[PDB]
Symmetry: C3
Subunit: 144 residues, 3 copies
C-alpha cells in the first residue's frame, strides 16, 4: 500500500497539462517529471468519473509490449500521438524477445519489449538514439 503495484514496466506520475473532451473520448495531455509530455486517450465516461481536470495529478501506465522503438523516421509522420526521443540505456535479451530501456531528456526511463531481431536490425546499443512510439489509446490512466 506504499505505492500502486502493477505489472506494467512503465508507470509515470505527472500533472494534466490539458484535457480535451469530445463527445466520445477525451485526450489527456500529461507533463511528466523530466519535462517529457505524454498524451493518453480515455473514454468520456472515464474522464468524468475520474474527475479529470487540467492541473490534477495522475499516473500513466503503459505495458512494455505496447511501445514501439524507432531509430529513423526517414521523413515519415505517424498517426501515433507519442514519439518520445531518448537514448538507449539498457538492453536485456531473451529467447525471441528483448527488453530495451531508453532514457528520455529530463531523466524519465521508458521500457519497450521488442523482438530480438528488431534490436539487431535497428543496431541498438547503449547510447544509440531512438524514439519510443506509443499510441495515446494504449495509455491507461490512474487517479489517486
Amino acid at each position: 500500500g506504499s505505492h500502486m503495484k502493477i505489472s506494467a514496466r512503465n508507470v509515470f506520475k505527472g500533472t494534466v497539462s490539458a484535457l480535451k473532451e469530445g463527445a466520445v473520448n477525451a485526450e489527456v495531455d500529461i507533463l511528466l517529471g523530466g519535462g517529457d509530455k505524454l498524451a493518453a486517450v480515455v473514454t468520456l465516461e472515464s474522464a468524468r468519473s475520474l474527475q479529470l481536470a487540467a492541473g490534477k495529478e495522475v499516473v500513466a501506465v503503459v505495458k512494455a509490449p505496447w511501445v514501439l522503438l524507432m531509430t529513423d523516421s526517414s521523413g515519415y509522420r505517424l498517426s501515433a500521438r507519442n514519439i518520445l526521443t531518448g537514448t538507449v540505456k539498457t538492453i536485456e535479451t531473451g529467447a525471441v524477445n528483448a527488453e530495451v530501456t531508453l532514457a528520455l531528456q529530463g531523466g524519465t526511463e521508458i521500457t519497450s519489449m521488442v523482438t530480438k531481431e528488431a534490436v539487431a536490425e535497428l543496431g541498438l546499443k547503449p547510447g544509440a538514439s531512438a524514439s519510443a512510439v506509443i499510441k495515446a489509446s494504449n495509455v491507461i490512466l490512474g487517479v489517486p
Copy 2:
C-alpha cells in the same frame, strides 16, 4: 470445426447483459460462466453487423500480452473498464517473459503475459491475490 481455434490464451463464452451503443462505438457487457462480468468496446458498425443484442451469446477474445496484473491499487482508480480479482494458479517463466494464470471467483481462468521482472516485483506466487486489468477496447468479440 468442433470449436474456434485462435491463438489467444483467453477465449470466454458468455451472454450479453447490456449493450450500450453511442454514435461511434458500442459498449458490450458480458456475463461469463463463473458470474464474472467483462466489458468490451466495439465499433457501431460491428455491433450492427454482428447483430448484438442483450441476451445473445458471444465469445470474448483477449490476447495474453494485453492483460496487466495488479496486486495493490493503493487507492488508485483506473481508466480501464475491467479489473477482475482472482488468485494466482499457475506461473511459467520464460527468458524475459512469463505466463501467469489467475483463477477468478466462479472459476474462470485468465492468462496474462508479463515480464519476469514484474512477477518478481509483484511477489506473485500460487495463492497470491491479484487483479487482471483489461481495457474494454482490447477485447475482441465473436458471434456464432
Copy 3:
C-alpha cells in the same frame, strides 16, 4: 535514412483505397502490394494532419504481439476488421513465446508473436492454413 527503421515486425507500403471519416475517427482502407487489403482506424485529427486521401501512399505498421492467429473460425464472425488468410512460412520458438510468419496470397508476409502453447494447440506447421486477425485500431499509419 534509406528507409524508416522501426521495431515493428510488420511494415507495409500501400495506397489508400478508401477513406471514411466520421466525427471522431477515420477508417483508412489500404491496398497492399500483393493485393491484400488492410484497414486502419486513426483519429480524425490524424486524418486531417496526415493529409490522408484516397489514392495516396501510406505505410501501415503493426507490432507482432498485436496480431492474433486463427485456424478455424468454426462459423464465428469477429469484431476485428482484418482477417487475412495465408499459409505458415516460418516458426521460431522461444522460451514461452514464438514468432510465426504467414505468407498471404499475393506475397505479403505477416509476422505474429504468440505463446508457444498456441503454436502447439493450433497445430501450426509450415504450409498450414491460418488467418492473421488484426484490429484496425492496432494499425499505426505513416505518411511520407
